[PDB]
From a paper:
To our knowledge, the apo structure of the human enzyme has previously not been reported; we describe the structure at 2.1 Å resolution and compare it with the inhibitor atorvastatin-bound form. Here, we used SPA cryo-EM to solve the structures of the apo and atorvastatin-bound forms of the catalytic domain of the important pharmaceutical target hHMGR at atomic resolution by exploiting graphene oxide as an additional support on the holey carbon grids. Secondly, to reduce the high background contrast from the glycerol in the buffer component and additionally from DMSO for the atorvastatin-bound sample, the grid was washed with buffer lacking glycerol prior to vitrification. Overall, our approach increased the contrast in the images sufficiently to obtain near-atomic resolution reconstructions of apo hHMGR and the atorvastatin-bound complex at 2.1 and 2.3 Å resolution, respectively, from particles adopting a slightly preferred orientation. In all crystal structures reported to date, a region of N-terminal N-domain residues 439–487 was found to be highly flexible and therefore was only partially modelled. Notably, in both the apo and atorvastatin-bound cryo-EM structures the entire region can be modelled as the density is clearer.
The rate-limiting enzyme 3-hydroxy-3-methylglutaryl-coenzyme A (HMG-CoA) reductase (HMGR) catalyses the reduction of HMG-CoA to mevalonate and tightly regulates the level of cholesterol in humans. Therefore, the human enzyme (hHMGR) has been identified as a potent natural target for hypercholesterolemia diseases resulting from higher levels of cholesterol. For the atorvastatin-bound form and from the apo structure in this report, the catalytic part of hHMGR forms a homotetramer comprising two homodimers arranged in D2 symmetry. The two neighbouring monomers of the dimer contribute residues to form an active site and hence there are four active sites per tetrameric complex.
Residue numbers in the entry:
A (entry chain A), B (entry chain A), C (entry chain A), D (entry chain A): 439 to 861
Amino acid sequence: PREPRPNEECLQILGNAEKGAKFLSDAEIIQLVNAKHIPAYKLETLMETHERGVSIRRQLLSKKLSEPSSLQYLPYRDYNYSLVMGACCENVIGYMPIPVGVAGPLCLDEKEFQVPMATTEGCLVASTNRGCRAIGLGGGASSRVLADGMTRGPVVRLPRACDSAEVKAWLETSEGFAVIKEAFDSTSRFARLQKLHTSIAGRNLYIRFQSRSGDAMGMNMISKGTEKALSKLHEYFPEMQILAVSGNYCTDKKPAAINWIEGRGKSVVCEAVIPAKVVREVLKTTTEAMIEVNINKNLVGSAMAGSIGGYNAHAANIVTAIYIACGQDAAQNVGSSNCITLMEASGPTNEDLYISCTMPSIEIGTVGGGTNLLPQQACLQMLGVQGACKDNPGENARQLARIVCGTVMAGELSLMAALAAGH
Amino acid sequence: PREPRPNEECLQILGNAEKGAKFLSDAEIIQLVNAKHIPAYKLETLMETHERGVSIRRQLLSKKLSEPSSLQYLPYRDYNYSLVMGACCENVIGYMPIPVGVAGPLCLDEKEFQVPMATTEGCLVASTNRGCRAIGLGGGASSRVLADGMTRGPVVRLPRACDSAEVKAWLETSEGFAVIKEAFDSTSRFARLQKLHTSIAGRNLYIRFQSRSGDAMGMNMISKGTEKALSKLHEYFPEMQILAVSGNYCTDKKPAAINWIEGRGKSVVCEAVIPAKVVREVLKTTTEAMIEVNINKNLVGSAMAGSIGGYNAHAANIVTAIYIACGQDAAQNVGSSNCITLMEASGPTNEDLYISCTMPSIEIGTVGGGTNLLPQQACLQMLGVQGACKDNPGENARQLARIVCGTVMAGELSLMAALAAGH
Amino acid sequence: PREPRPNEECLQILGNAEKGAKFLSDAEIIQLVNAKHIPAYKLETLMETHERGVSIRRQLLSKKLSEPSSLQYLPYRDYNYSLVMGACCENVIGYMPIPVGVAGPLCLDEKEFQVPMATTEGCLVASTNRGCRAIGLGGGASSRVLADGMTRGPVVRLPRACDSAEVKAWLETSEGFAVIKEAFDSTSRFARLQKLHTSIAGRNLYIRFQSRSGDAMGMNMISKGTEKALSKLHEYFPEMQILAVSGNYCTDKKPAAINWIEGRGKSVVCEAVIPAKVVREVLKTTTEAMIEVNINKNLVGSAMAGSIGGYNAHAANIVTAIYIACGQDAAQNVGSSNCITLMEASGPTNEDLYISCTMPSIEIGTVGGGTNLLPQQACLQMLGVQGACKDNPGENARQLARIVCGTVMAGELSLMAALAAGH
Amino acid sequence: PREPRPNEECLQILGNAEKGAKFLSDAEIIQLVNAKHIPAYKLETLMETHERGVSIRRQLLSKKLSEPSSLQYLPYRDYNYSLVMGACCENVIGYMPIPVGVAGPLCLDEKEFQVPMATTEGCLVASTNRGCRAIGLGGGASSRVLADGMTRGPVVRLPRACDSAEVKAWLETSEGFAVIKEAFDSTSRFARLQKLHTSIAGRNLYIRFQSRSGDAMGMNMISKGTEKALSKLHEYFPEMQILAVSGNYCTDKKPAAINWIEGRGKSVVCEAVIPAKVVREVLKTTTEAMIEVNINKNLVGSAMAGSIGGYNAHAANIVTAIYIACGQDAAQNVGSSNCITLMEASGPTNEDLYISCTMPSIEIGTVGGGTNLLPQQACLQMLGVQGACKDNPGENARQLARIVCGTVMAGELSLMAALAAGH
């Protein structure tokens, strides 16, 4: 054993650049932190290795818990914290393992994918797998990206609603839009402002900037561009007050009709045709039952519940699983799960099942944020969409959006079949 | 090195109960699986240890990838798969580490909590921490659970809309409700049917069963009860057809006005008062600016975007982080993030900031599903709400809902201050 | 001719109770009004006959118009103003004739109705007529009232959200509800409080009182009851502040999900089955086309437009026409037109067209307001629902709601057939 | 007295062009109609005068009523039916008088208006008048038209969702849009296609054509243009099926988020500043109370009710009254009443009340439909906006929209003051 050296003493070893942390014990570091000498947030930098830093943070936290042994089974060792510091999380005390299953092969646009799904919900992966199998036997699915651009919705305020109208009119002209577009586009190589969407409420003006962002999800880049554009706008209207760079008009991570109607991020449609025989043998139902359930649950049931954009069975399940697996911001599922699922009869006999999923607001990226960590990069890699696509910028993000829509469609197929076979 | 024994041979070692898997190589197991002898889904059971089983699955998957080395940095070893098999995930190929940070202390209802947040979004934990600090300096927050019950919304169909009306009327009487309540309650000790909510659309009848479920999230239990109740209902109306046990009328994991208006799971309100001085020094703004931004972003901005239940800054961020940390079903954030944030002036001088968050549909549990895994249990434990509360059933789930609402409120405070200080 | 006597002089004739207005000229009355002696609003009382009073008001108004001859073709003579004064309109300058057509016979619940429709929209009545004919040939329609009660949604405020929670909890107990119900019911013979619906937002508590109101539309009576109930509630919580007797939580004359989900006024469902032959010969289409159009316009189209409660073709047309004809408050069409139209195949061959309309929020009455005028009473009379039904209170209002739903259904049938035959 | 001549006989007088109807009695005409010789719908043409024709129709209808005397007080005489036949109504049996009151002067954009309001709701005109007075004392209101174009939302269907994507992409190019614009614009002098808005759902493509329409409301003209444009589109995609010219994507006469977000018809904003003294003396309240009520009723209350576009007190009342007075299609109030009302403190002391109303979807016209009748033209004339404005097409419709927004704002001011003074 041993015992803790006084503070002033300990604060010196820390300073000796040939004899630093590593000559101090956990108790000595604890003492230094408690005297408010060391800032606990700097532990991963201040300590010898990053792992130790998180160890020290864990010990400190444990001391303050009603059950000191709470963190025992929270894993923290043998994890690369270098990539998380100053990028992804703060006050780190370990990591939360989420089991990763694989659904597939998903036969989409003449290719095959193996889709990783990080979930703690039993049977979700198996159900998605059955849907994938049905689609595969059906001759594969097809998808298209319909629109692409991340949006940011700042709110500005003018002295009078008349002034707000003037600003809106000026933004609607070709010259004003050109000036704003130049200012916005100057901030990055992928910043290419598309048509603006404005909304007035009294003297509040809400401006929705939209743009592609390469392979990144685009929030940071769009925000930077917006800021620059708002400065430029302020030059012409010095009385304008920028109230908030985010005025809930984007709309980011909230249910909003605007995302459903205008789109946000990527808008995708996927479709497939399942032969009648396959619907019988794999899905254990019939086309007629599937259509009946689809109409009376996904359309009418959602309408009676007063849903905007929730005209599907469980798109949120698949979207969340894939998002967590692939390092996406999982909160964005709120907006990204918007989907409408349609089923119809098809074929020369009206016996085959046509299915389509439409998802207008898939917010997704393959660069930046959570996609900078190796484990999430692995899941992106097994799909073939990891990182930036140098040849055709944004192609990887588009492909990932297509895969997400296809997987959602497989999940819908399976769950709807299960509900229709019923009991 | 060595080389693979033939199939028939290999299939025998597998059978010898004194000489089973463990005498076979990875290549031999691969051969057996490829001949369709072994079902790959049974690998974790079929193999010697579970870890090997997932190893075999990983090798098989790697062979089919365009980049065989994709899984290199997806971790799978030294993880307890026994708790995941047949409960939480299928076709497991490893786990996805999500960094866990800690925000707090959160001073809520005269107690202090240390809230784990699993996120890959930089600065989220720090911002929540600043909000927690402001609330703490403000004399702590207060919360109340207003309603509690998980819901399931089956859809049934009658021959005619007149028959649907008859069934609805019968469900509305005391005798019919009593019969249905008895049938529903017989299925479990926590199943206590509360008042029914019906909606007709033509000959479709949508019935929303609601009930408390102890400390479990309640989906499985509510579904079981619903099934039993629907059988009982079928006894009185033999012409009734149960179309789907889930008719999107719950509503589960979709944006729906019904959850916002009636509630789903737990309905919570939290409030605090931040002194003016604290708003100046910690939040770097003023009360007036905070109220202006709150009105013109969370209320008016959300209204212009056509939001139902999205009258907040970023409740989804906090909700998702906590949910992933604590083993909740993360897809449920779709419904659980519904929140309205209100700010007003308060105090003898109208200088202090009153803030409140109202979240009517927090779907949450501390037993079952993802909460059965030790790492997620650790995060539940550091909050003091892990598992069932034997004395007062459902108390732990209620406490967790209160903490979620309080943390959301801290996050709102911080983000709104950041937006208001602006630039 | 003649010329105007001085004011003081003229003000005396007005006073002589044997020689009053009628001895004064229009110019003399004009002079008196312009000197601010007579209050123009009292003209119909102050003048000899009411008609003259409105004549004087018209002359005064004409003097102030840029085109003095504007009122020439606005009719005002030979109209009974006695019933409008102090009841229905103020500053009356005449009346606006709305042409009234008749659609029918509508074969509903084994009776025949002749439905008056006041419209200036060409072809609306003819289209409704064709729908009525199709329904009649189909063996008539059937309807049911599913729920009945007008609602008022006051908002009150407590010092703290905790206090609001306390009040909500107290309202949810049997004793508190009993006290409130007694207070509410004491105000009128039809005031019978049904279950309360509360919603908290911070320290705001929104309370939705619901009740039947006999044959009246019920707004006045419900408001009176609410006031009394709120006074009683204030007795138990002296800190409560009644912020507004209408907190937009009713919700009255605004689009709101709450009316769609919970109902407001009368909730009705109507249905019919149209034989295939009749669909061919009268509607000039086929059942399959009708169902296709219904799904892809009323369900999917409305979903893509982000509609709450607008899952129909043109229910608002029929509702407005009937409401204007029958003396209903026409603004209420905003809420009353909420409808979902469903069409399916039916019969032994799936060749016949089953149609149903569901309208959960028909706000309607046959006593009070506009129903006190003879012309509107005539339209109510030709339906057989005029005034109060002494035997079975509220029966006439219910019948009128059924007729409204049936007529809406006929209109939907016709318009949908027209759209499907297309070109 | 006399008695009825036989049919064959009577059918001949009808034919004699020197001795036609007018030599036949009401009983003889009745006999002819009942033998199915005369088509009752042709009565106004077939009879001598139009008035007689409606008389005959009334007698026929009376015979079939349970109370033959029902029509006694439904007026039909001395009304110009020539303008209603083949334009405005069918099977006419008279007209429904709606009392017309006048609110004003409304001081708007430096002019004064006298606004006619056709209502049977007591106190509505008086309340609007008080609001007008307050605004007038406040130095008048200001308004701006922000956007202008009526929309039509057809739905077309392609064989596959991929084909729908192809069509959407083609519509998004400059060349495709140019072709469609040419085809659309060829149909009328006011048809000037603006940017298209498309939405896919599976293989359904919803296209929202928008355009100004001169002074007409524009539905007929927009529909004609759409038809022509869809034919042109069919030329390039022969597999396209036009499913419905109206796919509920306009959206016409239904609550829809799309009208709220994108606008429909005219988008208007109006504002005023009420001095504190005027708020005290005329409105009998204070600015602080007004703002409190506005926030907690029009914003928070509407949010809790799950309103899209209903963030106001009673805009529907004013809109309906004006619409009925001025010959507008009253059903359109459903969409046209969408409004958000905002109140703030203003002035050097924050004592004055700033108010603004924003109405993005005012559907309105001053030519065609109900505006072709003299009584409604009178109400349009007293506003100075009757008919087409030859110099500046569409100016009259824009002015009327501004007046509607201003009147709505006055009504909001008054009602909100009444609610705030409370009791």
